[PDB]
Amino acid sequence: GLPWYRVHTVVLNDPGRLIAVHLMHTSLVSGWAGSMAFYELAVFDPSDPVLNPMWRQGMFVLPFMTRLGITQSWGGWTISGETASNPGIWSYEGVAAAHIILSGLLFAASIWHWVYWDLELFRDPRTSNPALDLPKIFGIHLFLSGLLCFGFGAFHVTGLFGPGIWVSDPYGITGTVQAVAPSWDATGFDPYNPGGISAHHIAAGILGVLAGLFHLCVRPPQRLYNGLRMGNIETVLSSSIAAVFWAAFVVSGTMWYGSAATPIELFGPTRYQWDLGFFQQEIERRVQTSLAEGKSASQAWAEIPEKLAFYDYIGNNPAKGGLFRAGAMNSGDGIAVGWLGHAVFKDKQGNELFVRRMPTFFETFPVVLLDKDGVVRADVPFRRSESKYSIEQVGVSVTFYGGELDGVTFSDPATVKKYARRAQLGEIFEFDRATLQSDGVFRTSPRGWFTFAHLCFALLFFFGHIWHGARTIFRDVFAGIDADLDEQVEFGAFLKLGDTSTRR
Amino acid sequence: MEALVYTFLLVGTLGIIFFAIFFREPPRIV
Amino acid sequence: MEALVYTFLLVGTLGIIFFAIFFREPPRIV
Amino acid sequence: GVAGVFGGSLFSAMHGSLVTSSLIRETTENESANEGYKFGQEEETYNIVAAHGYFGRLIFQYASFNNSRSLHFFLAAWPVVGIWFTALGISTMAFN
Amino acid sequence: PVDIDGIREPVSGSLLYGNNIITGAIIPTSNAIGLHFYPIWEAASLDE
Amino acid sequence: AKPNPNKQSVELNRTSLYWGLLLIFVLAVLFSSYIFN
Amino acid sequence: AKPNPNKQSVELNRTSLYWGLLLIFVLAVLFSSYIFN
Amino acid sequence: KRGWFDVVDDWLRRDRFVFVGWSGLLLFPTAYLALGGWFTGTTFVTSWYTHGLASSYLEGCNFLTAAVSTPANSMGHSLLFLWGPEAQGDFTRWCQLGGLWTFVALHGSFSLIGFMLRQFEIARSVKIRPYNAIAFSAPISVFVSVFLIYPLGQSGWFFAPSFGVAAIFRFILFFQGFHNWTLNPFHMMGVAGVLGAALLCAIHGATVENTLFEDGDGANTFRAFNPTQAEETYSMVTANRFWSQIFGVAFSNKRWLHFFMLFVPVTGLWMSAIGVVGLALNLRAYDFVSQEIRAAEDPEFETFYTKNILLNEGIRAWMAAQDQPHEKLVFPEEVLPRGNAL
Amino acid sequence: XXXXXXXXXXXXXXXXXXXXXXXXXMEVNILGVIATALFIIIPTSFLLILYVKTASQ
Amino acid sequence: XXXXXXXXXXXXXXXXXXXXXXXXXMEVNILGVIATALFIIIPTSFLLILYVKTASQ
Amino acid sequence: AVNKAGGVVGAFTPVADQVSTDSLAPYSEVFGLQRFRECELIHGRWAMLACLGALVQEG
Amino acid sequence: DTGISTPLGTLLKPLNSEYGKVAPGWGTTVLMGIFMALFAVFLVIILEIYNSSVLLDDVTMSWESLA
Amino acid sequence: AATPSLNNLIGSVVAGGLVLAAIAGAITAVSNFDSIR
Ligand code: CLA
Ligand code: CLA
Ligand code: CLA
Ligand SMILES: CCCCCCCCCCCCCCCC(=O)OC[C@H](CO[C@@H]1O[C@H](CS(=O)(=O)O)[C@@H](O)[C@H](O)[C@H]1O)OC(=O)CCCCCCCCCCCCCCC
Ligand SMILES: CCCCCCCCCCCCCCCC(=O)OC[C@H](CO[C@@H]1O[C@H](CS(=O)(=O)O)[C@@H](O)[C@H](O)[C@H]1O)OC(=O)CCCCCCCCCCCCCCC
Ligand SMILES: CCCCCCCCCCCCCCCC(=O)OC[C@H](COP(=O)(O)OC[C@@H](O)CO)OC(=O)CCCCCCCCCCCCCCC
Ligand SMILES: CC1=C(/C=C/C(C)=C/C=C/C(C)=C/C=C/C=C(C)/C=C/C=C(C)/C=C/C2=C(C)CCCC2(C)C)C(C)(C)CCC1
Ligand SMILES: [Fe+2]
Numbered sequence A: 001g002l003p004w005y006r007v008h009t010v011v012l013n014d015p016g017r018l019i020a021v022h023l024m025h026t027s028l029v030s031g032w033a034g035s036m037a038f039y040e041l042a043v044f045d046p047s048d049p050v051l052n053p054m055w056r057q058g059m060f061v062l063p064f065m066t067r068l069g070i071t072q073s074w075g076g077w078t079i080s081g082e083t084a085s086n087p088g089i090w091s092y093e094g095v096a097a098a099h100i101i102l103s104g105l106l107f108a109a110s111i112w113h114w115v116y117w118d119l120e121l122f123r124d125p126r127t128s129n130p131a132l133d134l135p136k137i138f139g140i141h142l143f144l145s146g147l148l149c150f151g152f153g154a155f156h157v158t159g160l161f162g163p164g165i166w167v168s169d170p171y172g173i174t175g176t177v178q179a180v181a182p183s184w185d186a187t188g189f190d191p192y193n194p195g196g197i198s199a200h201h202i203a204a205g206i207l208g209v210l211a212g213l214f215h216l217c218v219r220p221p222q223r224l225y226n227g228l229r230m231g232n233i234e235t236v237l238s239s240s241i242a243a244v245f246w247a248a249f250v251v252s253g254t255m256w257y258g259s260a261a262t263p264i265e266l267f268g269p270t271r272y273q274w275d276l277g278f279f280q281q282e283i284e285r286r287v288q289t290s291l292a293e294g295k296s297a298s299q300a301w302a303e304i305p306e307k308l309a310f311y312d313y314i315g316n317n318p319a320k321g322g323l324f325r326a327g328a329m330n331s332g333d334g335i336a337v338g339w340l341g342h343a344v345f346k347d348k349q350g351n352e353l354f355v356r357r358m359p360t361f362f363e364t365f366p367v368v369l370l371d372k373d374g375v376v377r378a379d380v381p382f383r384r385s386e387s388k389y390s391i392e393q394v395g396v397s398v399t400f401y402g403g404e405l406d407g408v409t410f411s412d413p414a415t416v417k418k419y420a421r422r423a424q425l426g427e428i429f430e431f432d433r434a435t436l437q438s439d440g441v442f443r444t445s446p447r448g449w450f451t452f453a454h455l456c457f458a459l460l461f462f463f464g465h466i467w468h469g470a471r472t473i474f475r476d477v478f479a480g481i482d483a484d485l486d487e488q489v490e491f492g493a494f495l496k497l498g499d500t501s502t503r504r
Numbered sequence B, C: 001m002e003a004l005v006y007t008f009l010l011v012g013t014l015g016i017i018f019f020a021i022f023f024r025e026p027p028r029i030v
Numbered sequence D: 001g002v003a004g005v006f007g008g009s010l011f012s013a014m015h016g017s018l019v020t021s022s023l024i025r026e027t028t029e030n031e032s033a034n035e036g037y038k039f040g041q042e043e044e045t046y047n048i049v050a051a052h053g054y055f056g057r058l059i060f061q062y063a064s065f066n067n068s069r070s071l072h073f074f075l076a077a078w079p080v081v082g083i084w085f086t087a088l089g090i091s092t093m094a095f096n
Numbered sequence E: 001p002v003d004i005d006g007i008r009e010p011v012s013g014s015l016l017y018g019n020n021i022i023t024g025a026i027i028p029t030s031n032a033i034g035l036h037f038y039p040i041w042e043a044a045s046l047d048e
Numbered sequence F, G: 001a002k003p004n005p006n007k008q009s010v011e012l013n014r015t016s017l018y019w020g021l022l023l024i025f026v027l028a029v030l031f032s033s034y035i036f037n
Numbered sequence H: 001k002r003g004w005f006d007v008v009d010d011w012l013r014r015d016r017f018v019f020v021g022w023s024g025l026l027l028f029p030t031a032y033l034a035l036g037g038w039f040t041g042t043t044f045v046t047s048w049y050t051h052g053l054a055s056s057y058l059e060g061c062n063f064l065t066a067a068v069s070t071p072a073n074s075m076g077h078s079l080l081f082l083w084g085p086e087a088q089g090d091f092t093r094w095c096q097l098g099g100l101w102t103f104v105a106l107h108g109s110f111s112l113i114g115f116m117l118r119q120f121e122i123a124r125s126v127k128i129r130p131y132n133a134i135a136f137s138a139p140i141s142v143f144v145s146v147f148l149i150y151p152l153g154q155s156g157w158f159f160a161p162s163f164g165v166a167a168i169f170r171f172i173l174f175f176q177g178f179h180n181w182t183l184n185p186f187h188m189m190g191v192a193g194v195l196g197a198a199l200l201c202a203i204h205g206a207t208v209e210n211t212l213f214e215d216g217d218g219a220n221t222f223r224a225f226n227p228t229q230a231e232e233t234y235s236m237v238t239a240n241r242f243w244s245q246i247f248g249v250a251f252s253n254k255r256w257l258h259f260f261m262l263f264v265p266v267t268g269l270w271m272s273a274i275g276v277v278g279l280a281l282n283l284r285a286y287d288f289v290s291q292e293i294r295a296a297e298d299p300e301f302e303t304f305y306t307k308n309i310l311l312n313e314g315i316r317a318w319m320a321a322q323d324q325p326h327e328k329l330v331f332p333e334e335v336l337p338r339g340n341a342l
Numbered sequence I, J: 001x002x003x004x005x006x007x008x009x010x011x012x013x014x015x016x017x018x019x020x021x022x023x024x025x026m027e028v029n030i031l032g033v034i035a036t037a038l039f040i041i042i043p044t045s046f047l048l049i050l051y052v053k054t055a056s057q
Numbered sequence K: 001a002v003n004k005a006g007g008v009v010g011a012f013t014p015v016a017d018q019v020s021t022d023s024l025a026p027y028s029e030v031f032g033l034q035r036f037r038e039c040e041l042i043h044g045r046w047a048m049l050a051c052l053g054a055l056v057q058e059g
Numbered sequence L: 001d002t003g004i005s006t007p008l009g010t011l012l013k014p015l016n017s018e019y020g021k022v023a024p025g026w027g028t029t030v031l032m033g034i035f036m037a038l039f040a041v042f043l044v045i046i047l048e049i050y051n052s053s054v055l056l057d058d059v060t061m062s063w064e065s066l067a
Numbered sequence M: 001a002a003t004p005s006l007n008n009l010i011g012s013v014v015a016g017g018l019v020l021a022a023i024a025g026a027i028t029a030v031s032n033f034d035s036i037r
Helices: A002-011 A015-043 A062-068 A092-115 A134-157 A193-219 A222-227 A233-257 A271-275 A280-293 A297-301 A306-311 A331-335 A413-421 A446-473 B001-024 C002-022 D002-021 D048-060 D068-094 F014-036 G014-036 H004-011 H026-041 H092-094 H099-126 H131-135 H137-153 H165-178 H185-210 H236-245 H256-278 H289-297 H304-323 I005-009 I032-054 J001-008 J030-055 K033-058 L007-016 L029-052 M004-033
Strands: A165-168 A175-178 A335-339 A342-346 A352-355 A368-370 A376-379 A397-401 A430-431
Touching: A002 A015, A015 A092, A015 D002, A062 A092, A062 A165, A134 A193, A134 A233, A134 D002, A134 L007, A175 J030, A222 L029, A233 A446, A271 A280, A280 A306, A280 L007, A297 A397, A306 A335, A331 H165, A342 A352, A342 A413, A352 H185, A368 K033, A430 I005, A446 H131, A446 H137, A446 H256, B001 G014, B001 I032, C002 F014, C002 J030, C002 M004, D002 D068, D002 H131, D002 H185, D002 H256, D002 J030, D048 H099, D048 H131, D068 H185, F014 H185, G014 H092, G014 H289, G014 I032, H004 M004, H099 H131, H099 H137, H131 H137, H137 H256, H165 H304, H185 H236, H185 H256, H185 J001, H289 H304, L029 M004
Parallel strands: none
Antiparallel strands: A165 A175, A335 A430, A342 A397, A352 A368, A368 A376
16 A cells, blocks of 8 residues: 555656646645635725735735735725725736636646556657656746746836836835846945846846757756666656755745845835844934924924835834734734834933844843943832932933923933833834733734745755655665675775676 | 525535536436 | 643644554564 | 663664564565474574674674674663653653 | 732642643642651642 | 456554554644644 | 444545535535624 | 776775765865864964954864854854955954854855765665665755855854854754754754654664573674674564563564664764754744733743743843854843853 | 723724624534534544444455 | 522532632633644545555555 | 666657648757748848838938 | 647747757757856856855945945 | 956966866876776
């Protein structure tokens, strides 16, 4: 009897039913994409693109549709918040319906290619046995890959015939779907340059076509054919599994580190923007320039976009979640309602204090207020018996500039402590924890979840490379080793290992 | 949730109909 | 309700252990 | 104790992989290799000399147990001795 | 719940008292007991 | 006609059933606390 | 001891499977609305 | 008349005392440098300018406290070549910058590939199955996830485990305090794999030794064996009946037993590797929210989980100031969480 | 002053959408999902066990 | 009567009890019941289908 | 029980420059003199039109 | 035994005909090794740019290059 | 416009080739000097 872990090996040497089995996975994957999109559209709230973006609602496939140009819904709304203008077929609902319809067609084709497995196409004309000319098939299917790679970068991304791709400003404030022009110089290899994407898919497409032509014309070397077992289709599986986990590692790195293909306006900020003070530095710079124009601190902070401030909140950091804190970031800390304005903490003598921001590594972090030169001046003491820095005996007050609480100042220690705790999380926002009953613990964005999933898949698929790779090479000994082997395995019997013609 | 469970039950029932018609046990004479 | 799930899972595992010991395939010599 | 369990885990994996790598062909590829062994067999189900040859070349000839009895004593002694000492360690640390 | 530290601060370790399988435990004997033998018959009540 | 020559029959002995049932239940025991959270 | 002489083997043809699957799903469709209530 | 590949293949796969093979071209260079880098780093190279610590014998450390420490956090994930923009060709400054860690980590990671290729190379030559190479994927998964993937998800190489005994202990205690790594269900499966494999190693070794057939007249039973003997050395039937009546269940298949001895340890390390991949993103199983909600609302509900949560807070606060000098954390003592007395 | 009225001031709806344009989140016992699930899988498995046994002859 | 409505709550507690002092734990996912049920039954059924098929031959 | 990989079953020099009814691959061999001459002529005739066409439309 | 013949099958049949045909010896292996070496160098260069171990004047390698 | 970091990257690639060439050269020399048959 066949073991349960070798059941799907019956199509190993059946090209007709291998296509049928591969058509079924294709039907399911497109079926999932359509089903996933429809669910997300049933839960997504497009009313507030600034304080309730996609990445705060746990939307996973919505950013990927938006990344390539899908921005409008049949419901009449646009992802940017403007009103839809004749969405046409290719809406969020249309793309979801298309992947669903495709799923049904692939399901039907799978049944046909399964019932009619005994096609003369899959027969070796020399031996009349089922066989696939894998070196030629690879050239065919690579030429299509090169052709499709070229067209995506030359028509779709470039904008010649297509929507372009999502391009954002450096601080994720103003991002739209634009037609990007290929950048052919060294800046084309800048990961944060969207012009490199069009240039790459054009050049790799051209080389993909030419490589497909070569691999379609030139027969493999005899030595390479035997060394790589090119007559065995499990060789293709080993190399494909190797290539797909290489791509999974790369695609996880560019998601975690950020690139032009993972805009923060679609997937949320990266953990390194919080670590390096990417948004905080920009916010202080804009406020400082407005102060240089002789504007009041109350009105300079009011100029700061609320979208920019929301990025400076540690709750939007993708490295603050948990493996089993499931759901949307809204389910963790609530739905963002409004900015409370910048909180500036002042000593009793008037010196300004800064709350030490919480590093990403800390689940909890002591609240400590520093002055300009970095010296600890006040804090919330754990031991309130002989404290020397408690805000009560330092007279710390908090005043808010901009936002909802602009102008309002608090002096009682209880509220000053409350906002000091909020201040170490970055900017202070008002959250609605009643609609979805948020617990109060942070969650990861789609950036975090995508990275974890495709890193775990990448690691598991390395074992696949080793297993399926060892299976094809060691196929002749899969059921066991030869009975009489001792003479060859003897130490020193032969000069060269294995070679029986090199007897010592 | 209910709307998701109603749709799965309905399409699940439709899926059975498809298999009962095309993937049926063929009636064979003797 | 979680306590119901936890208890069922634990006593379910012990049920498998009982059956694996007494309702096992006997090892028969060749 | 850590060397006992890390080593014991290493030796379990090596012994299991070396015996599995040396299974004498007695089945087809549509059956489990386990089927090649019949409970009560009087003959060996894997080639010890072949496994020793592999591990002999893997590091060097004399780093491998040619003797199954010595090998299995080592498989038992290493984790047992290691766990004996870590059990003593907690016992000694009981008296500070 | 069991007063493990002898400081009259019981620690819950049962499933029916709010623990899951990971956090559930049989709490060690109270620190007030020490190494003293504490069979059920040396207690005034089974609640104690 | 021409029946497919690649037919095989899956097999699962009773000891594999116990190993499989133990794995499914022990995995649920391990992960249930986290899913419930 | 000697084997039990009352041993029988249960059978379920494919058409019975489709009827059984149809009944379970149709009955679920019927009662699901009321169970959710 | 043979070509270069054939004449070279003849020499590389010569059956000598230490087999070289084609994979030896990658293994022995990289493995020697990784070994040499560690011995050199633990003996002469300091971590004074990277961690503010002494980590060499020359500085006064012993085998337990010497280590090859990671670069400073300001270096990020720099590969830190000898010729890179950091320590541009200056060997001594390269050592002071922690560049020896990436040297050991990189040449060490390619040595693991070389050794696994060596297992494939020898197994094909000896004409046996490649299950030792498959077993070696588990240690590689552990090394790849712990020494490469985890720091790559963090700020930089600084948070990777430094190559040392006490340095690994700090890495271990860091994971408890910051990640609650014990509570993670993937270390739990890793523990069960390692402890289960240690159990199998001991129980199988003892079972074989105590079911041995009498193949000699000497009390020394080790000598009564021949590697080429066809008969089995121990009674599987007695072994099977022993464990059936002692434990209730026993192995009846010799092949299954040895595969299980291979599956338990490998699966354990692989499951543990998945968990560390999650910690790379701080995607950790730190806490049970339901109990935290209950504990916050009810100040009398205490479990061993909540006690551990307070222990982690102590670890993080009392360790961050020195373990993370780049953060420049000046905590006055009044703000550190401390219990009564002690 | 206190931000207790800030969340109240959010009269403009700010919440993930319900399945209906007129909002569909009604009080249905979630035990219905489990009851429907058990009523489907348990008898389905019973039938599949008997059919696969029969189909294998 | 709202005075008497809240009089009972602050006074002797309401009914339906709870396991031990408190075991509501409404934060519990509850969807974990479906996750745990589906993760048990679906693989269990798969194993039972194969065993009954095997045991009958 | 044993699935050995295939070995050299023989050396053959296929006859090139043989056109067949196969629409997708008419010639017997890719590397044939007559197939290349058709490629040389077709590539060449396209270039002659292109070279003149580029000049004329520019002027 | 010839299998089911279809119009699409006869059209695509030439593409699945030269199953075992190989070039004798090492063929174009050395040429393949050249491209792998160039590809390896290309992969290194783009890795260094992202890792910031190679600093190019025009590239900035940060979010600020989105401007 | 080659930065010094770019030059070292090119130098490292060349140095890597020399190390590989030195390895291959030594192996080919010994393999020819010490040949079987
Ligand atoms: C006409 C066909 C078609 C079209 C136009 C689309 C379009 C779309 N799909 Mg869909 N899909 C299709 C077919 C199609 N799909 C089929 C047949 C399946 C079944 C497998 C799917 C399964 C699927 C899923 C699961 C998902 C989509 C999604 C999407 C949306 C985002 C795509 C994206 O950004 O991902 C990016 C695409 C890539 C990154 C491809 C990378 C290419 C790799 C790296 C190849 C590299 C190796 C290559 C061989 C190198 C050699 C060649 C080279 C040398 C030249 C988008 C609107 C996503 C979505 O938004 O959900 C609705 C989603 O998750 N699709
Ligand atoms: C690469 C694949 C991928 C990724 C990255 C995501 C990512 C995401 N999904 Mg998702 N999804 C996927 C595939 C994926 N999905 C598939 C294949 C399905 C079909 C089942 C779904 C169906 C789905 C739904 C219905 C929802 C999401 C939601 C979400 C978002 C919340 C993430 C979350 O909380 O998960 C949490 C993950 C965990 C709590 C545990 C991870 C799995 C563990 C690590 C494996 C352990 C083994 C197993 C669990 C043991 C079982 C034991 C037993 C007791 C259960 C998030 C951005 C939610 C959302 O935000 O809505 C917008 C949402 O409701 N997804
Ligand atoms: C097979 C043995 C081997 C291997 C695999 C490695 C691998 C590695 N070494 Mg190491 N090393 C070795 C032997 C080896 N070394 C030896 C014998 C020594 C002398 C003792 C050193 C001394 C050494 C030092 C001092 C350092 C390294 C470093 C490194 C790492 C990065 C360096 C690098 O590869 O950049 C370059 C990449 C390449 C050279 C790719 C090669 C591809 C081929 C050769 C291209 C062919 C070139 C040819 C001219 C064609 C021109 C193409 C054209 C486009 C220009 C890397 C993982 C660095 C490190 O440890 O990082 C911290 C480092 O500082 N090594
Ligand atoms: C409609 C779309 C899918 C909806 C799914 C909804 C779920 C409920 C319906 C399906 C479950 C009930 C079917 C029972 C099958 C049965 O008894 O006959 C067994 C059939 C009959 O064919 C076998 O084929 C044999 C030929 S051979 O031996 O295989 O060559 C032949 O003897 C004879 O036909 C028969 O024995 O055996 C099969 O080969 C069928 C494949 C296994 C069943 C697949 C179930 C899942 C379907 C897809 C699910 C995902 C849907 C989304 C798609 C993107
Ligand atoms: C969500 C799932 C529920 C989880 C529940 C967990 C607890 C139970 C786990 C059971 C798992 C094992 C299944 C396979 C067992 C097997 O193959 O048996 C082997 C024997 C062999 O057949 C018999 O064999 C006999 C001898 S021998 O066994 O063949 O040697 C022979 O004489 C006789 O003719 C023949 O019929 O099978 C049986 O006949 C056993 C009885 C049928 C199985 C019933 C199991 C369910 C019991 C109810 C549990 C729930 C309620 C409990 C309340 C107290
Ligand atoms: C007298 C006191 C008894 C002490 C108690 C002993 C407990 C017995 C536990 C065995 C049940 C496991 C069944 C294995 C499934 C089974 O019965 O397979 C039976 C199997 C026999 O395999 P064979 O040699 O027959 O294999 C032939 C091939 O067909 C293999 O497929 O025995 C073993 O594999 C040995 C491993 C036993 C060790 C089991 C691991 C430890 C149990 C873990 C329990 C989890 C904790 C639960 C707590 C809630
Ligand atoms: C036939 C036909 C039709 C219809 C069709 C359809 C209806 C389709 C769809 C289908 C579908 C509707 C599909 C879906 C699917 C789904 C899937 C396929 C999923 C799965 C899942 C998974 C696989 C997961 C797993 C896991 C979990 C659970 C946990 C965590 C981890 C993971 C994630 C891994 C039409 C009308 C067109 C017409 C024509 C014909
Ligand atoms: Fe053994």
